[PDB]
Amino acid sequence: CPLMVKVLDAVRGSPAINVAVHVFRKAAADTWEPFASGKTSESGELHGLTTEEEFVEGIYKVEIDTKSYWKALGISPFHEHAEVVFTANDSGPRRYTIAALLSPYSYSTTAVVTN
Amino acid sequence: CPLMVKVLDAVRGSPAINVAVHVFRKAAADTWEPFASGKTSESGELHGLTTEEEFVEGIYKVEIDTKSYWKALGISPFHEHAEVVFTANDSGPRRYTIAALLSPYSYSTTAVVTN
Amino acid sequence: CPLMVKVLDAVRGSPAINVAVHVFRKAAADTWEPFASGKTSESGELHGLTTEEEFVEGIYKVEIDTKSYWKALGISPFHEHAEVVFTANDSGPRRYTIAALLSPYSYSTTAVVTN
Amino acid sequence: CPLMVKVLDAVRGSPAINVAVHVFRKAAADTWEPFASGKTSESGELHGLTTEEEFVEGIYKVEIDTKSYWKALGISPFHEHAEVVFTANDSGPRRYTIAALLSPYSYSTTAVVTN
Ligand SMILES: O=C(O)c1ccc2nc(-c3cc(Cl)cc(Cl)c3)oc2c1
Ligand SMILES: O=C(O)c1ccc2nc(-c3cc(Cl)cc(Cl)c3)oc2c1
Secondary structure, three states, X not given: OOEEEEEEEOOOOEEOOOOEEEEEEEOOOOOEEEEEEEEOOOOOEEOOOXXXXXXXXXXXXXXXXXXXXXXXXXXXXXXXXXXXXXEEOEOEOOEEEEEEEEEOOEEEEEEEEEO | OOEEEEEEXXXXXXXXXXXXXXXXXXXXXXXXXXXXXXXXXXXXXXXOOOOOOOOOOEEEEEEEOHHHHHHHOOOOOOEEEEEEEEEEOOOOOOEEEEEEEEEOOEEEEEEEEEO | OOEEEEEEEOOOOEEOOOXXXXXXXXXXXXXXXXXXXXXXXXXXXXXXXXXXXXXXXXXXXXEEOHHHHXXXXXXXOOEEEEEEEEEEOOOOOOEEEEEEEEXXXXXXXXXXXXX | OOEEEEEEEXXXXXXXXXXXXXXXXXXXXXXXXXXEEEEOOOOOEEOOOOOOOOXXXXXXXXXXXXXXXXXXXXXXXXXXXXXXXXXXXXXEOOEEEEEEEEEOOEEEEEEEEEO
């Protein structure tokens, strides 16, 4: 599990459940190719997006669909989504956790990178 | 204005208005002595807390009454208040802005220290 | 000034100065069209991006060049940039401030929308 | 495990290891009584602070010793510590995770409360 995404809700004080997440990888023709996608679990975690074989060096974009999350809770939020863009595996394979903390008009994100 | 406090609301996407803020200075007998206080303005700012002459080096605590702010909005909060504890150090001319971003179950704070 | 961007540095406790910021507007053919850009000031603010006449309703993307900012400080960063994507909605007179707080492996952003 | 504390480092992109944490509980004579303490593990988590029997209703303060954490890494930070103050178990037992994300001049905290 080299890429995991964890999403928390700062209004409710809970994991953000059923949040859609799309991962893209930058291609040779300077375009965002689809790479993996999933939804967060009851623990607000999304596991199994990729494998050590598939997750090669590259520039990745993790798009967290915060707007649909807030709209499903009957709230009109500010952002369309939260995007996290980074170079991965540049000095060999690493394990990445991308965490996001959400509020209707704000979000924070951090990365935990382990070898 | 050597010390200013700015408070933002992450739920409404606005300044946090009429928030009570209490500042204390640590005294030699390990006790917190009231130093300054006020309510944030319509811009979520609290100016005029102290003067350069009164704001000496030492340990200060800024306590933001977040619970009353959320209750006045009819929103259920987690924290009793938000406390920011720091040391004021004289090292050339310095202005301290303590900023806080509030959500019901979370808060963030940063210091903007400038000449 | 209907759109302002403010960027803070969580490592140095200061405004993030001379940060490049690019704003784009979403066009009918699902593409991002350049809209406005600039570099943050000594106060970490970028004023004068647009005018009330040019800033129509629509989806906007604010891309903050965080990687170049950290490299100029000799600090190793994680993100390629920070992107803030939102919808501008006309509902009475509104000013949008997009604020971001930067750290090498994390960032937070909030919207301050006022009359 | 009704009370857990998780601490992340936003500069390194890692768990914040060996962070001291002290928990206090407000007493009848309006004083902060010591309740539990520990240090975060290699995963930046602190488990086993208390038991469901001991963790009764009350106002608790979780003090995270961020200053000693940054000083042990050879960095001079802004805050003395990060304090999280909240009422616990007011409507019966709950499980609380207090998470904190640290930078030298800033911190964020959130709570995950589950039944
Ligand atoms: O000094 C001012 O005028 C000023 C303005 C905007 C500001 N936005 C913040 C802020 C933003 C985020 Cl995303 C997280 C945190 Cl902790 C703080 O602090 C500000 C200070
Ligand atoms: O409980 C866990 O396992 C777990 C994991 C990753 C986590 N990242 C956060 C986090 C992120 C931001 Cl951007 C701000 C703050 Cl305050 C916290 O909390 C986590 C908790």
